[PDB]
Amino acid sequence: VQIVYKPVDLSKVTSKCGSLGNIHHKPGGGQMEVKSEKLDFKDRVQSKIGSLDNITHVPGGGNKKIETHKLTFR
Amino acid sequence: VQIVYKPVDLSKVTSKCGSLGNIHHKPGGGQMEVKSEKLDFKDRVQSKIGSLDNITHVPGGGNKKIETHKLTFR
Amino acid sequence: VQIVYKPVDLSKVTSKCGSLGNIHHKPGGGQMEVKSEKLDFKDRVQSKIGSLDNITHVPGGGNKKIETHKLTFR
Amino acid sequence: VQIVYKPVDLSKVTSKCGSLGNIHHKPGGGQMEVKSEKLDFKDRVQSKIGSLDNITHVPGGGNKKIETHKLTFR
Amino acid sequence: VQIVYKPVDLSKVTSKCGSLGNIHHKPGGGQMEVKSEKLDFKDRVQSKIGSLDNITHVPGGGNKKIETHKLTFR
Amino acid sequence: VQIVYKPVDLSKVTSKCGSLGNIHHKPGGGQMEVKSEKLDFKDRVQSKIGSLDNITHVPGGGNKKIETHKLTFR
């Protein structure tokens, strides 16, 4: 029984941008009201309650490469 | 029994942009009201309740390459 | 029984940006009201309650490479 | 020539209210854009340009009596 | 020539209110943009340009009586 | 020529209020942008440009009586 996992990646995720700019994130204020009575969160729970969040994200590049490799033998 | 996993990737995800700009994210304020009584969230639960979120995302490039590799032997 | 995990990565996640700038994160103030009565959070719980958060994130590059490798033998 | 201006007012503008309340003025944000080039406003001009105004007016009483009296002799 | 201006006012503008309350003025943020080039405002001009105004006015009484008296002889 | 200006005012502008309260002025932030080039305002000009104003006005009484008297002889 012979298993040979030889993946090969010579790829290139690339970007060229000239001027990147003149960006205005100016939201008028938000209004939020949250009320939570009885919360029984027992096993592997991810919760968010009442977020009011402003983000500006201006990466010059911002290129993402996600690889996963899974060899499972049974 | 002979297994040979030899994938080959010479690909290129690419972008050229000139000027990138003059971008105005200006939303008028939101109004949100949330009420949650009895929440029994037991196993592997992802929850969001009451989000009020402004995002500006201006990547110069923003090119994404997702690869997955799964070799499963039984 | 012979297993050979030889992955090869010569990839390049790359960016070129010229001028990166003139970025204005100026949100008008948010209004948030949170009330939580009875919260029984027992095992592996991640919670957020009442966030009101302004972020500006201007990486010059901001290129992300995520690789995972899992060899599981049974 | 005999002029006799004898007006008589014994009137009563009246109100009774019990509980006055539980009033919620919660408008989502407005969006307004105004541009005015050449405005030659010379004599007795009242102008408003670009109003974006929220009012809540809860008088307990709020009863108005307007009287005018004009005697003009020529 | 005989002129007799004898106005008589025994009026009563009145209010009774019990509890006055539980009033919530909570508008989400407004967005306003104003641009005015050439404004030649010469004689008795009242102007407003670009107002963004929140008012809450809760008078316990708030009863108004306006009287005007004008005797003009020529 | 005989002129007799005898106005008589025994009026009463009145209010009774019980409890006055539980009043919440909580507006989310406003966003305002004003630009004014060439403004030639010569004679008796009242101007406002770019107001962003929050008012709470809770008079216990707040009753207004305005009287004007004008005798003009020519």
Author numbering:
A (entry chain E), B (entry chain F), C (entry chain C), D (entry chain B), E (entry chain A), F (entry chain D): 306 to 379
Sentences copied from the publication:
Dominantly inherited mutations in MAPT, the microtubule-associated protein tau gene, give rise to cases of FTD and parkinsonism linked to chromosome 17. Here, we used cryo-electron microscopy to determine the structures of tau filaments from the brains of human MAPT mutants V337M and R406W. Both amino acid substitutions gave rise to tau filaments with the Alzheimer fold, which consisted of paired helical filaments in all V337M and R406W cases and of straight filaments in two V337M cases. V337 lies inside the ordered core of the Alzheimer fold, whereas R406 lies outside it.
